[PDB]
Design an enzyme around this catalytic site. Sequence first.
Site, PDB file in Angstrom:
ATOM      1  N   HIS A  85       0.824  -1.215   0.000  1.00 49.48           N
ATOM      2  CA  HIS A  85       0.000   0.000   0.000  1.00 49.48           C
ATOM      3  C   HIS A  85       0.872   1.286   0.000  1.00 49.48           C
ATOM      4  O   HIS A  85       2.062   1.272   0.324  1.00 49.48           O
ATOM      5  CB  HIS A  85      -0.990  -0.002   1.195  1.00 49.48           C
ATOM      6  CG  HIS A  85      -2.115  -0.990   1.083  1.00 49.48           C
ATOM      7  ND1 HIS A  85      -2.818  -1.444   2.186  1.00 49.48           N
ATOM      8  CD2 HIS A  85      -2.663  -1.608   0.010  1.00 49.48           C
ATOM      9  CE1 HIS A  85      -3.758  -2.285   1.788  1.00 49.48           C
ATOM     10  NE2 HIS A  85      -3.685  -2.404   0.476  1.00 49.48           N
ATOM     11  N   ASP A  87       1.063   3.924   1.895  1.00 46.21           N
ATOM     12  CA  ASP A  87       1.705   4.371   3.145  1.00 46.21           C
ATOM     13  C   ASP A  87       2.988   3.614   3.462  1.00 46.21           C
ATOM     14  O   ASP A  87       3.673   3.948   4.447  1.00 46.21           O
ATOM     15  CB  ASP A  87       0.739   4.346   4.355  1.00 46.21           C
ATOM     16  CG  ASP A  87       0.132   2.950   4.656  1.00 46.21           C
ATOM     17  OD1 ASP A  87       0.132   2.042   3.773  1.00 46.21           O
ATOM     18  OD2 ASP A  87      -0.392   2.821   5.821  1.00 46.21           O
ATOM     19  N   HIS A 148      -3.850  -8.134   7.379  1.00 49.73           N
ATOM     20  CA  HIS A 148      -4.281  -6.887   6.723  1.00 49.73           C
ATOM     21  C   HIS A 148      -4.123  -6.965   5.197  1.00 49.73           C
ATOM     22  O   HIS A 148      -4.927  -6.396   4.444  1.00 49.73           O
ATOM     23  CB  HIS A 148      -3.467  -5.715   7.333  1.00 49.73           C
ATOM     24  CG  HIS A 148      -3.562  -4.416   6.576  1.00 49.73           C
ATOM     25  ND1 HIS A 148      -4.578  -3.501   6.768  1.00 49.73           N
ATOM     26  CD2 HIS A 148      -2.753  -3.879   5.624  1.00 49.73           C
ATOM     27  CE1 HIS A 148      -4.403  -2.471   5.946  1.00 49.73           C
ATOM     28  NE2 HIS A 148      -3.302  -2.672   5.229  1.00 49.73           N
ATOM     29  N   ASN A 179      -9.409  -0.185   6.669  1.00 46.00           N
ATOM     30  CA  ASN A 179      -9.254  -0.626   5.283  1.00 46.00           C
ATOM     31  C   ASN A 179      -9.032  -2.139   5.255  1.00 46.00           C
ATOM     32  O   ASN A 179      -7.939  -2.620   5.581  1.00 46.00           O
ATOM     33  CB  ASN A 179      -8.069   0.105   4.655  1.00 46.00           C
ATOM     34  CG  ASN A 179      -7.831  -0.288   3.216  1.00 46.00           C
ATOM     35  OD1 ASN A 179      -8.535  -1.135   2.653  1.00 46.00           O
ATOM     36  ND2 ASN A 179      -6.844   0.350   2.594  1.00 46.00           N
TER      37      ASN A 179
HETATM   38  C1  R38 Z   1      -3.891   4.184   3.053  1.00 43.41           C
HETATM   39  C2  R38 Z   1      -3.756   3.267   4.274  1.00 43.41           C
HETATM   40  C3  R38 Z   1      -3.217   1.900   3.823  1.00 43.41           C
HETATM   41  S1  R38 Z   1      -3.149   0.659   5.171  1.00 43.41           S
HETATM   42  C4  R38 Z   1      -5.099   3.018   4.950  1.00 43.41           C
HETATM   43  O1  R38 Z   1      -6.066   2.830   4.291  1.00 43.41           O
HETATM   44  N1  R38 Z   1      -5.080   2.962   6.402  1.00 43.41           N
HETATM   45  C5  R38 Z   1      -6.218   2.689   7.289  1.00 43.41           C
HETATM   46  C6  R38 Z   1      -6.150   3.741   8.396  1.00 43.41           C
HETATM   47  C7  R38 Z   1      -7.431   3.992   9.193  1.00 43.41           C
HETATM   48  C8  R38 Z   1      -8.751   3.721   8.845  1.00 43.41           C
HETATM   49  N2  R38 Z   1      -9.544   4.114   9.836  1.00 43.41           N
HETATM   50  C9  R38 Z   1      -8.804   4.643  10.828  1.00 43.41           C
HETATM   51  C10 R38 Z   1      -9.164   5.191  12.073  1.00 43.41           C
HETATM   52  C11 R38 Z   1      -8.180   5.676  12.930  1.00 43.41           C
HETATM   53  C12 R38 Z   1      -6.836   5.622  12.561  1.00 43.41           C
HETATM   54  C13 R38 Z   1      -6.477   5.077  11.333  1.00 43.41           C
HETATM   55  C14 R38 Z   1      -7.475   4.587  10.467  1.00 43.41           C
HETATM   56  C15 R38 Z   1      -6.076   1.283   7.892  1.00 43.41           C
HETATM   57  O2  R38 Z   1      -4.940   0.801   8.152  1.00 43.41           O
HETATM   58  O3  R38 Z   1      -7.087   0.577   8.147  1.00 43.41           O
HETATM   59 ZN    ZN Z   2      -2.335  -1.252   4.123  1.00 45.67          ZN
HETATM   60 ZN    ZN Z   3      -1.537   1.442   6.744  1.00 43.43          ZN
END
Ligand code: R38
Ligand code: ZN
Ligand code: ZN
Length: 231
Positions: A85, A87, A148, A179
Amino acid sequence: AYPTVSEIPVGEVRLYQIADGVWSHIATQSFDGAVYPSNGLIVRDGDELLLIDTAWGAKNTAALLAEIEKQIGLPVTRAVSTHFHDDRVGGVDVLRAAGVATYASPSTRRLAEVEGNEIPTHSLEGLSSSGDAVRFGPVELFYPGAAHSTDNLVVYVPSASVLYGGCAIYELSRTSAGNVADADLAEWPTSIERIQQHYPEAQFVIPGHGLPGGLDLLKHTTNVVKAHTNR
Ligand SMILES: C[C@H](CS)C(=O)N[C@H](Cc1c[nH]c2ccccc12)C(=O)O
Ligand SMILES: [Zn+2]
Ligand SMILES: [Zn+2]
Ligand SMILES: [Zn+2]
């Protein structure tokens, strides 16, 4: 003391010392309307540094390299991305132009290419089966199984008892799934149990997003995943 989204404008990066020779890096990004924080790792390797994950984008990763040079002053010679991904790989081209050797598993490189994301140059061998571990400089890399994402790796620093879980491990304040578009919900709890079995001595556990804690973050993540499964 750990910095949050309210304190880091998009485009800036902070460093946080966890133990002697081990830091996390923290950055922020806009995603479909909201701002989220993201963590990576920096580990001292003699007179050099190993980087774990980009700072979620080209501009953020340039700022990361400038902050490392200002605050630590040792060269970043290698980087590892822990899944495909943006990030984790967004900013790989900035690292490469700066002379950093970029690494990921063959599974991560394949998935990044399919998605049209940036692609780390070098392939990490010995991580294709669940439960596999390899030494890479001052860290151990471990493939726990699909969670994940199907390719996700975790990173352990034995000298400091620091476990970096990446996005397979959730911070305690997150009680709902995020996600999961690329996740294996059926296997995620089994993969977490492999982490617990391999690293029972871990003292500091760092999630991909948000606040560090201890080994409780593993069972917390399993609880959140099972609740989502039963939606
Ligand atoms: C773009 C990145 C790739 S893992 C992404 O989608 N990141 C989300 C971040 C996220 C979703 N909801 C949240 C609530 C609080 C803090 C963080 C989040 C994940 O890792 O699920
Ligand atoms: Zn990811
Ligand atoms: Zn992430
Ligand atoms: Zn919990």
